[PDB]
């Protein structure tokens, strides 16, 4: 599980 915090980023992974 990977959370992505930036513009244009798929929150989930």
């Amino acid at each position, epitope marked *: *599980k*990977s*959370i*992505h*915090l*930036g*513009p*244009g*980023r798929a929150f989930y992974a």
Partner: antibody
Amino acid sequence: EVQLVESGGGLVKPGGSLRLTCVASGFTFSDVWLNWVRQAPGKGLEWVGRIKSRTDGGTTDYAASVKGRFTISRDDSKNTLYLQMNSLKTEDTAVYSCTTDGFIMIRGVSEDYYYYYMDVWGKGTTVTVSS
Amino acid sequence: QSVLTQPPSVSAAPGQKVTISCSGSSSNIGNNYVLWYQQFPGTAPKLLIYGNNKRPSGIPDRFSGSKSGTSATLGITGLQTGDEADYFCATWDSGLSADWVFGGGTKLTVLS
């Protein structure tokens, strides 16, 4: 020696075109998303656009102030990022810099968090749109 | 004419503390996570704060960040002359192009 070096800036007539290039070194360039940003004298920094990494689809996003006029492309094999600026306006005058999106990852008790930020910044190249 | 609003200038003597405010909307600071950078003349901006209040390794606890509503604040305590620099906030936009967006910058003077 991680670095980004921009070139191509100069004096251009309004209505003109100009191509900037940014050369990356010291890091796996193909792995990262890249931004163009710009700063007018006495003004704040302004984001121009990004291009994502090939694995993330390679697509581009643009600021509303440049969309339709500016085009961003990368050449992974030459560690090179480009910005093709057409129909330049006096108000596009600025120091234009290239940046990477970096991250700090926090390993959570279950799951990893990725905090992104403009990480590596080039020193910039001056574009003057003036008659 | 800067997406996020900061004061142009702030100052105090060594030993003192200071805060620098950054004002935005629901669409940047409200929805997203704020970053702070320190820049010296001629030099690349250095990440000071991410995720509203997290410090990278090497950044001492003298620097602290907070966010509430649509504003964010950076605090610096035990001011050193080495802190004299420009500070700017950054976050991103919730719109269709998800622009990164920046404060205009605050020049901190450490009074000498």
